[PDB]
Structures are given as C-alpha cells and as structure tokens.
Structure 1
C-alpha cells in the first residue's frame, strides 16, 4: 500500500526542535493509523539526506548527543549566513490540538475512500496554514541547521516511493523529461502573442504529462520543479476541487490562502481563468517506483519500457486533445470571423497536425535491492547511489544532447510537396509553395495578399466569404504574412488562450466540457504587442494629464472609454485599464502609423510632450553553472576559476576545491559537533591517512553520554571510520554528495525566486514572457532596465531594499513573514538585454538574445578577486546590445560571489555606478559630451595601471565636461584595473570596464530616438 506518506511525510512534525532537548514522536497522529517503523520510515529518514551520514551514523537517530539550547539556521549552500530560531515556537502545547483542528478545517468535505486527494490537497496547504501559525521555520536537524524542516519532510516522502518499490520486492527508477528545442520554438512568432503563447505551449504541454503522474502516484514523486509554489499545480488542484464541487465558501479556505502568497496580483486564475505566467521548466525529472496504478491497487512489472513509451504517448495525447478542442471551438464559432479560417484549415490539413511541434527526450535509470541492501540494513557505499543514479540520468541526457531532432523532421511532407498535394489558401503560389514568414522552415497554407486591395484582394479570393469577416481576418493576421499549420494554430491560440485549459487538467474533464464551459463565459483577453510596451511612458504622460493635454485626441477613441471587459495577464494592464485611457488601442494605428504621424508630431509639441520611443527591451536572465550545482559541483562556487572541463581529473584543483568546501562543511555544524568535524576533517594528508586520526579526538562525542542513556554500544571504531570514509570519497574527489533534500531545497528556492521576480518585473512596467526557476524573459521600457537588473540580480541572491508582494527579502534568505527561506546568492546569474525596435522581427531578436547570452556566458572572462588575489572569472555578466553596440557589465568582482554575510553590496555595484551617472547626465550637472570625450581619455586610462593616475584621469574627464564646476561624482577605485578578457570572436567588446560603463549608457540613451 502507498499514499500513506502522511506519516512518511510527517515522520516528525515541524515541532522537531521543540521536542529535542528542551526549549518547550511526541505526537504521532489523531486522524490516521499508527506510523510503523521497523525499517519502513527508518530508511525514509536515513537515506533522505546526508545529515544522518555527515554527522556520524547514530547522532541524528538519537537527537541528543551534541545538543544546545540555541538553534542556528544555515543556508544549504554557504553555511555562514545565520538565522536563530529562538523561543517563539508552534502554537502552545495546551492548544497543540487546535492547529490539528485547523488541519481538519477542509479535509472533511469529500469522500475518504481515496487517498489520491486526501494526501495531496494538504501537501500544498501544509506549508501555507503552518506559516499562518508563523512557526518561524525551524531546521530539520539542530546539530546541522542546513536543511529546513518542511524541506526534509518532503524529501523523505520523495524517496519513500523507492522505499515502497523495495517493499514490493525491488524496483525504482529515475525518469527525466526534457523538451528538445525550446529557444527555437519560442523564436517563431510575430507580435509577442505568438511568443508568450509558445512559451505557454511548452509550459502547458509539459504540465499535461505529469498530471497523470501525480494522479497515479501523488506529488512528491516529482523532484523538479518542486510542487511547492507552482502557479500551475495551484490552479490545477484548485479546479480539481472546484469540479469535485464545493461552495465558493468551502474553497475560500484555500482561495485567499493562495492569493496572498502565490498570485500576489488582482487579476488571477479566476479572472483570466488561466495562470497569467508560464512557469513550468521545459525539462523535469522524476523518481519513479515500479508500481502501476490501474485500479484498487498498485501492481508492478520488472521492465523499464513501462515508462519510456508511456510518457511519449501522453505527451502527444495532450497535443491531440488540444488540436481537437480547437477543432470544436472553431466549429462552434465560425459565425464570428477568422474562425471560419481556422475551421477551414483544420479541415484542409489534419494529418500534419497529428504530430506536435515539439519533441521530448526521456531517459530512465533503474535501482534494485542489490548493493542498496544486504538483508535488512544499509552497507558501506549504500548512501552512495542516489547521486550516482542521478549522474547516470544526466549523463544519458548530455550524451543524447549531441544530436538534435527538430520537430519538423517528423512531418510526412514528401508526397505533399513533390506534387501539388499540399492545400494552399489564397494565392496558389507561382513557385510551387511558400515558406511561412514565422517559421521559415515549413510550407505555409495561408498566404495573405500582401497589399493592393486588401479589402477586395482577399474578398477576390474566397478566403473572405463575405464583406464582414475581413475585419476579424485582417486583425489577427497582418497583410503579407504566411502561416504554416503549426503557426496558424498559434495565431488562433493567440486570438484567445482560454483553450489551453484542455492542456492544464491532464484530461480531468472531458474536452467538450471544457470548451463548452468556455463558450458560455465570454470575455476579451489582450496581449501587449511590442508597439504597446514601446509606449508605456507615452500613456503615462497621457494618464497623469488625461485630457489636460488631450483635447483633439478626445475623438480618436484613445482618449475615450474602455468599453467592454478587456483584461490582460499584463499586470500593468490590470493597474491602468480603468485609468480612462483604453490600453486596447493599436499604437501602430495612430502614431506608430505612418500617415497619421506628422499630425501627431505637431500635436504633441504644443502640449510640450515627447515623441514616443520606438524601442522595447527584451530582458532575459540565466543561472550560470546551475547544472553543476544540482549535480553537486563547485563551479557555481567558483564561476570562472574552474570550468566543467576541469572536472575530468579534479585532482589538479586540490587547492581551490579542497578549500571552499571545508569552510562550508566544517562550518556547517555548530555548538560542539562543529569541533567534532573541525578536527576530523584535515586528518587525511595532515594525518596517518586512515581511521586513527579521529579515534584520539573522538572522545568528545562520548563526553555527553550518561544523563538519560539510550545508546546500545559505545565501541565506535566504525562511526570514526565511516565519518572518515564519507569525507574521503568527497575530498579525495572534491565534489559534494547530493541528496533528495539538496534537490528539493534548490527547486523550492527556485520557486520562491519565481514569485519574487514575478513581482519585480511588473513592479516596473514589465511583461513576463517566461518566468522560470533559474531563467526569465520579459519586455520593459528602455527606462526601467538597469534599475530592474540591479535589484533582480540582488533579489536573486536574496537581498531586499523593499517588500515585494509580501515576502521579506533579507540578507541571504527570503523570509515569508516568519519563514526564513534560503535564497541562492552563491548561484550566479547572467543577463542579456536587447534594445529592439518595435518593427523588428521577433524571430531575430529572440535568437540574438539567446545566443548573445548563450555564447557571451561561455566566451567572456574578466579580472576577478579570488582569495584576495586576482583571477579571471568567466560568468555572471550582464550583456547589452543596441544594434551593433555591445556592452558588458560584470556583476560580482569576487569569487565566491558573496563569501561574507555583508558582501551583499558587492553585487551589481557597477549598475549603481551607471545609475548615479545617468541620473546626473540629464539633470544638467554633466554635459552630453561625457560619452563623446571618453574616446580621448580611454587610451591613457587603459594604458595606466597606477590607479591614482587613473583616478585623476577619470576625475579630469568628469570635470572637463561639467555644466557646473562643483559636481564631484567619483568612481570607486576597484573599478579601474579590471579587464574584459574576450577572445577570438568577431564580436566587438572594449577590453576595459569604464568603456563598457560608457557604452551601456550609449545604448540606453540611444534607446530613445
């Protein structure tokens, strides 16, 4: 039997530090059977993390051998930023049952014949109502406060699946999914409608496939991304219960409990009826047992193929559901316009659409009883497989990555193209067929007349069945466009995204139920085109002064009433829709239009208001060396000093890698156990190399035994040998040991970051396209880029000049109002920013942003400060490009990034410099020539290495183009000798920082012409 993981999950409550050695299972259960432990949850506690093998082999199972009244709280990555859990504790012992009544506030509305709900509905709200008790986020083991309590309570439930797979007789699998070409698929689009919905396509298509998983096995079978703050799992579970059928009062226990934490906005999954942000990673792993759910029980079959194909069929089944739902919708709607077209084509082509425009890989490694056990216990090298099997998985991945199968290579076109067997709508192409202007790699089936009589020209072609539908046609499809089947699907799905619900639920409803629920509710959804975001201030200059500077525009339906219902996923559309101005205009029709332009140019001048700027800003981010950190390497700790390739024979870096883990591992302890390690560590080359160094000093463990003695034997010639072999296999090879706890903690930390940068983006007039665990994509006005980065980088490391939605962004952690949650400061993060004309093809902008940061991360070294001396790092850059004016701003100038608790202002300091400079250039303190005269001082500055000569040269260049004579804005000295070591590439980058400070402002002040 499975799904009883509540006791596998709650093998001990978050009251752990409140039952351990004072400061007050003590409570087992009141609404379930007794939790069994012969070796059942024993393994769940011992194999889930290293804390039971890092500190000895029995201390964690005793929870009293090195105790202490004060309980630290350490970061999992850099155990130096501290937190203290103090006295405040889960609500009083005398009322400890009330919270259980608060447990039972919504677990008693639906039948308790099945656990596939009664176990997982609480999963997501477990962490929620608990922080309403404000429990202050205790750690799991107080002798090692590196893993918070809830994280371990989930990590144990993770490998509980493998426990049960050994409880049948033996099985267990690590399956990994990953869609193949994402950055390619996203490239196809024309108005950012297609962009955001192709992102949402990747996301929802991968969300469809693991719904089945969480219904056959329940969550916590998934490792990445953590199903903790999933904006998709939230909506999914929520609508599951809504279809289960309960008064909005009955769900109101969960609705606000979400909206206050997740979905911190107003327009949410109940106003768009869709999650306004795609957050699923295009690749996800799974720890899968050998059981099979087909009814009433869980049977097993010994094969591995029972998943490799049963996941592919589900992935394609989701696409089939979507395409047939679009068939039903376009049928139910031909009487509008532009839907006649979608029906007509889905009938003119059906078989090309029988294969999804994405692909996936799937690898799935095994596990057995052999060498995981002998009879009933764990042997030497038994904690040493999970990360082994994990590496096996990622090795299969990166081996198969050598080949690339683009989706189209699946299509059966040969006959359809050799002869006129391909259907064309519009002009039967003179040359046999055309390529769609969006993919450029497929034959298009809709070919708009370019422009001569666009009104008649297509009414001259029977595509326009009558004089009416031409508006709904000419709206969603620009003249001259050419659409393949796959891109007409996306143009349609951009006409409305609500049909993606068919993909969300993993076939929970029927398809007709979904589409006919959404043909009743009828509401207009809008998506910000590049022309919109390139006019943000242009509306603000017309929002503060509504009609004060609008009198002639009072008739052009821009200064007029927002009419029906229009609502967007764009948060800045939820906070200015009712400002009187309709953000539903098409700015390419009034002033970003050609004929109606010069009029407006003489119009705005008398109201003394600017011409708008034809530039948005495609920001994207990336976490440098994320894979090595999940694998468990130190390239994230030393981004630039060591590369992946310097891990083939890691024995050369035995200076760096052997440091920087000690100071973490040896410090990750506290109290007295720290000394337990603070001596035992170096005694390998420092000592007789074998298990007799610690035997001398082991005694300060046995120096606490007899107060309530429980232990069976004190003859530790093994727990000194085992705590030596542990560190020997990990310093002899200077990697880390990876745990389920490691992974789940990092994925959760990625989800908190997801929330916080989702708030960051729309804090500015941003527009998310894809907020991911370690990545991002957005469009911002060219005025809010730097200040954004400057925080989003900092915020990623965990640092707040502000409360974001309701999350406290402290130093090193992200504390949810009592829950100090660890952030990822040690993880690097690069940025890539493109200042793009609104009339630029998105295909190219996306490609040359992705590749820009794609090779920019892997090409540019800069002079950094490691161990106090000077090294050359390779990642954590912030690249810009106007159109041929590339610029690069580093972001750390230290390695590791923040090795001290107050290093949190080293990060992105350069952009503070650029802000203090740009702020004063335009205030009339410093002339415009500051950026035209550097081409006279640059040579001396880069030829200098006596930093006070350089300081005086900079001071002179600042002073000689000052409008006053009395401004004294100085650059820090440390920004003088750094050098941007780019090598052998036709891209042009200045080889000294201040030139890049100059070029960044060149770009940005140029993004306003």
Structure 2
C-alpha cells in the first residue's frame, strides 16, 4: 500500500555488549536495553503506520508495547526481554529514508538521555565519588561520541511471490550497510574508562565505587535497572547468581523462615555495613566460607558457627547454578511468515515465561532463542518443558552449563554458548541437549543427550533407586575411562550384578533393561561413547557438592 516496500532493521553493538557481562544484573541490563532499542526503532513504524505493519517480530502480545505504548499495567512481565535485534516491516516507499534517519535519531537521543541521567545518578549517589560541579567534565565530547557510535543501526529497504528472495536480499545488503562504520574500563575493557585520559591509574581506581572505573556504556548498564524501576515499578526478583542458586530445594526460603532474622542480626552484630533494610547486603553472605575467608573476629566466628549449625540441621547451601541457552535448529510467502512470527512470539512471550517463572530468572526469550539462569534442581525439567512447548507450538538444541557461583560470569556464558553451538548443534540431526558441569576444582564433565532421555530416565525405577550406589557410577565410569576388554554389555551386566531378597532378580533385570533403553538416547558413534555420556550424566546429577 502506497508503493509497498519491505524494510529491515538490524541493531548491533560494535563490542560484545551482552557477552562481556561481569555480573547477573549486567547481563539482564544488557539484554533488556537491546530489546529496548529495538522498541524505539519500532515505535516509529507503529506511529507512522501501525502494529500490523511489522511482520517480524509479531507485536501482538509484546510487553514493551502493552506497557510503554498502550499504558496497560503488566507488572513484572515487563522485566523479560522479548524483542530481537532484527526486524522487518511493510512501509510506503516515500516514508522509507525518513523512517531511517528518524530511527537512527531516536536511538541516538535515547542513549544520550540515558547517559545524562546516569551521570546525574552516579554523582548524586556517589558511584563516581567526585564533585557535583564536575558533572560537565563527564559530558566531554569524547564520551558522548562513545555513546553515539556504540550501536550500529542498519536500515535497508526494497520495493515489492519472490518475497522470500528479496528478504534475503535485505539480509545481504544489510550485512553490507552494517560493516562499513587511556585506560579502558574495568567491566568490559573494550573502550576507555571515564577519566581514563586525564588521571593516572592507581589514582583513577580510587575515584570509583570500588576500584571500578566504568566506561560510559557500562555506566549506562549500571543506571539502567534504576531507570527501569523508575518507569515501571518493577525490578528483577533475583539480583545475583547466588540468589538463583539458593532456590535449590527452597533452601533460602526455609533458612529464611527459621534462622533468617537471627542471621541478619549476627551479621549486623559484626558490622552495620553487611546489612541494608533488614537483610544481608550480599547473598553470598549465606555461606560460612564467605566469612571464614573474604573481603570483631569473635563475632564473625559466632556467625560462621551459627551458619554451620544451620547447615547441619537444614542441609548444606547450594553453591552451583545453571545457565540455560537454547536455539532453534536450522532456522534463518508473507502469510506464512506472519503465521510463523505469531507462533514464535507466542512461544517466546507466553510459553517460555509460563514454564520459567517463578522457578528462575528468564533473561531473554525472542525468536528461536532462550537465555535463562536457573537453580540446578530446575534446569533439566525447565529445558525439557521448553522443548515440549516448542514442539507443540520443529527442533531445538540447548546448552546447560552448571557452574560454581564464584566463576566469572562471562566465561561461564562463553562456555554455555560453546556447548550449544560447538557441541549440541554438531550432532547429526541436532535436536540435542548438551550438559556441562564445571566443578570449582577445575574438573569439567560433558554429556550430549537427546531430549527423550530425560523422559525415559524420569520414568525409570533407576532414578528412584538413586535416591543403590554412587560407587556404581564411579566403577562403570572407570571402566569406560578407556574401554573394557570384555565389551560393553558384559561389563554392564557384571557391574550391575555387583552393585545390585532373591527378589533382586527383578531389580538387576529391570535396571540393566532401562540402561539399555537410555543408551538409545545418548549421543555418540559407538556404545562406549554412549556409556560414557550416560554415566557422565548420572555423575553430574548425583554430584553431592553440586546437589546438596
């Protein structure tokens, strides 16, 4: 209509914006902000035409639009990032470039507004710990330039059966129109820290919240959650990975319910600086080790002892958490495009949220992609359920990295990604879950399994009987360390007999059967690889440091 023309928007950071996150809050803010940029982009198209002009993503149920456009109060549903960094729409030929420069302008202006607000906020609350009339010093054109040039917005359009050809034309010409375009800070470390020119290093570090001289973009990342709290009334329930870890078997709920106030008291009794608003200032303070180590001694001893007694009664505290990353297999005629986009939107916005919350933290769900932080006891069932919904609403691969709470976030993320792309997606036929466990010890276990293994195993008397040995797993694992000379079946039978009341005839009978079934859904070229994968999986889910 009015010279119908297909338009494509691609927003990309010139640095690994999201991937550089040093903290859970930073990851959430990264993703949320990207989705937000795309929101501003799309606001122009909606303003000029309307929501039905945007083919992908479908705006039908989009929380950012319901909240920021229509003013509906959706509450905490605003906290998930649902908008991808790529979009296409139908517009009239004449509006095209106008829309282009308007989208660019609105994104620039939005980012600059956030930078300004964020500097005010930094000075007022003293993250930058310098004098209030030195605000101007931070608006020095260098920093603004960094904020302006950080995101590349590629807008392309072509005039309008062969539609599927010109969509890829826009993919191409767009992948063209993108590429052409002191001491760097302590979070990302790609770009210059603020005051990273004028001052000298050791001196510089002391200007900052704790020894951490943010760049303008990381400054923005840090303000953004208070900004969102301003606009909405909402903030993510779990601020750090430890708050997610602690949801294992309701550990933190239970501890809170019984010993919580006492713990806050003994913590405060150590120092008023460990407590804010009648709760621990950092959740890693639920760990004895944090007191025995990190960074009055008799009061800290009192706390350590109180916690240790607590563990004896309620069980040891979970230190591990799971990163779930999922991507649709082999995914890259307008009616069917709209129907596809509506199906993807409904998967992303409704189904995924429906399974995840409140059991964990859903960071991003958009297109064929999911990113989420989960307690270790929920990861498998959540992954599985999301795959089921995807198949109801067609294949999907996932990496799951189970990791120690002290592990650097960005490295854990790079690893989860690496499980997804470099492992699961290199299986013939794909449709695979790749599970990693990285122990604090530095030891790393991987198991590649088909989605059905989770079902079959959940339904098995074997799972039940494992909560018959943990030494069993160790023994057959030491058998497939390098292969058994007698072969795989003989080895299994033997170790089963060994690790198991004539009634056991049944048990050994059944278990050996189930195992065989399970070996069906473990990925590998040969039976020994399948046994290694399956028993690595079992070692992973039986691990007592990981599952206390």
Tell whether the structures are fold-level matches, with TM greater than 0.5.
Answer: yes
Q: How far off is 1:758 after superposition?
A: 0.7
Taking a change above 3 Å as real, the CA distance of residues 391 and 484 of structure 1, as seen in their structure-2 partners, is closer
Residue from 389, 395, 403 that aligns with 2:166? 389
Corresponding position of 1:593:
290
Corresponding position of 1:57:
none
Q: How far off is 1:532 after superposition?
A: 1.7
Corresponding position of 2:222:
491
**Uncovered stretches (5+) of structure 1, i.e. residues with no partner:** 1-163, 166-170, 240-254, 270-274, 293-305, 368-383, 411-432, 448-453, 464-472, 502-517, 560-565, 567-580, 628-738, 799-822, 862-872, 892-907, 983-988
Corresponding position of 1:555:
265
Corresponding position of 1:606:
309
Structure 1 residue matching 2:40: 3-state secondary structure: helix
Q: In structure 1, what is the Cα distance between the partners aligned to 2:486 and 2:340? A: 44
TM-score, with length taken from structure 1: 0.46
Corresponding position of 2:376:
782
Kept in 2, the 8 Å contact 1:176–1:283? The answer is yes
Q: How far off is 1:176 after superposition?
A: 1.4
Corresponding position of 2:449:
890
Kept in 2, the 8 Å contact 1:937–1:957? The answer is no
Taking a change above 3 Å as real, the CA distance of residues 366 and 979 of structure 1, as seen in their structure-2 partners, is same
Q: How far off is 1:962 after superposition?
A: 3.6
Please give the residue correspondences for 1:740-779 in structure 2 after superposition, counting only pairs within 5 Å: 740-754=334-348, 755-763=350-358, 765-779=359-373
Residues 699-743 of structure 1: CA distance to partner in whole angstroms, max 9, x if unpaired?
Answer: xxxxxxxxxxxxxxxxxxxxxxxxxxxxxxxxxxxxxxxx21111
Higher helix share: 2
Q: How far off is 1:625 after superposition?
A: 0.8
Taking a change above 3 Å as real, the CA distance of residues 605 and 333 of structure 1, as seen in their structure-2 partners, is closer
1:957 aligns with 2:495: yes
Taking a change above 3 Å as real, the CA distance of residues 595 and 203 of structure 1, as seen in their structure-2 partners, is same
Corresponding position of 1:533:
244
Structure 1 residue matching 2:378: 3-state secondary structure: coil
Kept in 1, the 8 Å contact 2:194–2:213? The answer is yes
Kept in 2, the 8 Å contact 1:194–1:491? The answer is yes
Corresponding position of 1:1003:
540
Q: In structure 2, what is the Cα distance between the partners aligned to 1:854 and 1:183? A: 20
Structure 2 residue matching 1:286: 3-state secondary structure: strand
**Structure with greater Cα Rg:** 1
Please give the residue correspondences for 1:165-314 in structure 2 after superposition, counting only pairs within 5 Å: 165=2, 171-181=3-13, 184-239=16-71, 267-268=75-76, 275-292=78-95, 306-307=96-97, 310-311=99-100, 314=103
Q: In structure 2, what is the Cα distance between the partners aligned to 1:181 and 1:435? A: 17
Q: How many equivalent residue pairs?
A: 510
Residue from 907, 913, 928 that aligns with 2:470? 928
Residues 311-332 of structure 1: CA distance to partner in whole angstroms, max 9, x if unpaired?
Answer: 2552353232332254246548
Residues 461-486 of structure 1: CA distance to partner in whole angstroms, max 9, x if unpaired?
Answer: 6x4xxxxxxxxx74xxxx34342222
Kept in 2, the 8 Å contact 1:889–1:910? The answer is no
Q: After the TM superposition, which parts of structure 1 deviate over 6 Å for at least 4 consecutive aligned residues?
A: 523-526, 581-584, 939-943
Residue from 817, 828, 849 that aligns with 2:416? 849
**Uncovered stretches (5+) of structure 2, i.e. residues with no partner:** 197-201, 270-275, 294-299
Kept in 2, the 8 Å contact 1:879–1:886? The answer is no
Q: In structure 2, what is the Cα distance between the partners aligned to 1:998 and 1:497? A: 45
Q: How far off is 1:881 after superposition?
A: 1.7
Q: How far off is 1:1005 after superposition?
A: 3.6
Q: In structure 1, what is the Cα distance between the partners aligned to 2:484 and 2:335? A: 50
Q: CA RMSD in A?
A: 3.9
Q: In structure 2, what is the Cα distance between the partners aligned to 1:400 and 1:319? A: 21
TM-score, with length taken from structure 2: 0.80
Q: In structure 2, what is the Cα distance between the partners aligned to 1:583 and 1:752? A: 38
Kept in 1, the 8 Å contact 2:115–2:147? The answer is no
Q: How far off is 1:996 after superposition?
A: 1.2
Corresponding position of 2:321:
616
Q: In structure 1, what is the Cα distance between the partners aligned to 2:13 and 2:445? A: 26
Please give the residue correspondences for 1:29-178 in structure 2 after superposition, counting only pairs within 5 Å: 164-165=1-2, 171-178=3-10
Q: How far off is 1:334 after superposition?
A: 4.4
Structure 2 residue matching 1:327: 3-state secondary structure: helix
1:360 aligns with 2:153: yes
1:993 aligns with 2:530: yes
Please give the residue correspondences for 1:502-901 in structure 2 after superposition, counting only pairs within 5 Å: 528-537=239-248, 540-541=250-251, 543-544=253-254, 546=256, 548-549=258-259, 552-553=262-263, 555-556=265-266, 585-591=281-287, 593-595=290-292, 600=303, 602-607=305-310, 608-627=313-332, 739-754=333-348, 755-763=350-358, 765-798=359-392, 823=393, 827-861=394-428, 873=429, 875-883=430-438, 885-891=444-450
Q: In structure 1, what is the Cα distance between the partners aligned to 2:243 and 2:76? A: 22
Q: In structure 2, what is the Cα distance between the partners aligned to 1:858 and 1:183? A: 25
